[PDB]
Design a protein around this ligand. Structure first.
Ligand SMILES: O=c1ccn([C@@H]2O[C@H](COP(=O)(O)OP(=O)(O)OP(=O)(O)O)[C@@H](O)[C@H]2O)c(=O)[nH]1
Ligand SMILES: C[S@@+](CC[C@H](N)C(=O)[O-])C[C@H]1O[C@@H](n2cnc3c(N)ncnc32)[C@H](O)[C@@H]1O
Ligand code: SF4
Length: 279
């Protein structure tokens, strides 16, 4: 297997408290920028073309994030560099310094009601979201949305906002139940209350049939179709077995085979696309 698109969850720490979080703040480890430049360079030669900087909240570590996305673009010559943010801590001066090297910026908002955001776990607003879009236009970054369809917001009509906001990519996740993260009271979270049925999700997706960018991801396709990197730089298996050893201590090949990655769901959910800043 060739790791084309990789999600580097370099930290688990965050300033929000979404009830359904499936990458909880179980540890506060973050890698040295020396070791992270090992893994990303090791992963580039292995076949990586898109990197996604996610985790807990990546803008809690703006210096690390800034050093890596510059390294990933300028010296690694990577096809596409992405970031996924909740939007609270994003600031324009960051996009001044590094926006030349950001190819896709993904702001995730689950509702446009401040009341719904409160119930889900975002205290507050949406003016920030429109602001980041304005910044993305100025600094030539591709702007995408990530909303999670859950019990609170599965009835909403988000069309009017998405025509003006107009993202090139709009992911709608059916709430996922990662075992170990948000499947019991023992864990940091418990998302079973926010679960919605297959038809509840389809009503949401069918309601936004006017949206061309809409890319749905039910639990069929989201569960085991991602290449996830720990803060310790090890691939996470979402099939049942424990995580691999670090790519820093063993290398990419041994780490990838220690994890199940369904390349068919990867292609079905639209994992390969026009991810570059051109074309
Ligand atoms: O079990 C899982 C599954 C998924 N995830 C995480 O959910 C996040 C969803 O975030 P995205 O869907 O935006 O990842 P992406 O940038 O790679 O997608 P494309 O650009 O290719 O369209 C991903 O970063 C993934 O790692 C988990 O944390 N755990
Ligand atoms: C874990 S977040 C990491 C980046 C950043 N913390 C953020 O909120 O965007 C990655 C994406 O997964 C989504 N997500 C979080 N919990 C989820 C869940 N339980 N089911 C499906 N998607 C979820 C979020 O909306 C976010 O867009
Ligand atoms: S969904 Fe994102 S912002 Fe919310 S708790 Fe999880 S990592 Fe933090």
């Amino acid at each position: 297997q060739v790791p084309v698109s990789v999600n580097y969850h370099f930290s688990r720490k965050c300033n929000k408290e979404c009830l359904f979080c499936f990458h909880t703040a179980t540890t506060s480890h973050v890698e040295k920028p020396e070791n992270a430049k090992r893994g990303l360079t090791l992963l580039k030669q292995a076949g990586m073309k898109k990197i996604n900087f996610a985790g807990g909240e990546p803008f809690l570590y703006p210096k690390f994030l800034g050093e890596m996305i510059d390294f990933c673009k300028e010296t690694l010559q990577l096809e596409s560099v992405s970031i996924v943010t909740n939007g609270s801590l994003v600031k324009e001066q960051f996009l001044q310094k590094h926006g030349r090297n950001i190819d896709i910026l993904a702001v995730s908002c689950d509702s446009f009601n401040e009341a719904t955001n409160i119930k889900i776990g975002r205290g507050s607003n949406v003016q920030k979201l429109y602001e980041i879009g304005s910044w993305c236009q100025k600094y030539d970054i591709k702007f995408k949305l990530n909303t999670v369809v859950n019990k609170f917001n599965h009835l909403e009509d988000m069309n009017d906002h998405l025509n003006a906001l107009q993202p090139f990519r709009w992911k709608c996740f059916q709430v996922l139940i990662v075992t170990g993260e948000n499947d019991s009271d023992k864990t940091l979270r418990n998302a079973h209350s926010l679960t919605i049925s297959d038809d509840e999700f389809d009503r949401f997706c069918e309601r936004h049939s006017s949206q061309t960018c809409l890319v749905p991801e039910p639990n069929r396709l989201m569960a085991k179709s991602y290449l996830i990197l720990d803060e310790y730089m090890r691939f996470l298996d979402r099939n049942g077995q424990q995580p691999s050893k670090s790519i820093l201590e063993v290398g990419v090949q041994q780490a990838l085979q220690a994890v199940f990655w369904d390349e068919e769901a990867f292609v079905e959910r639209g994992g390969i696309y026009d991810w570059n800043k051109s074309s």
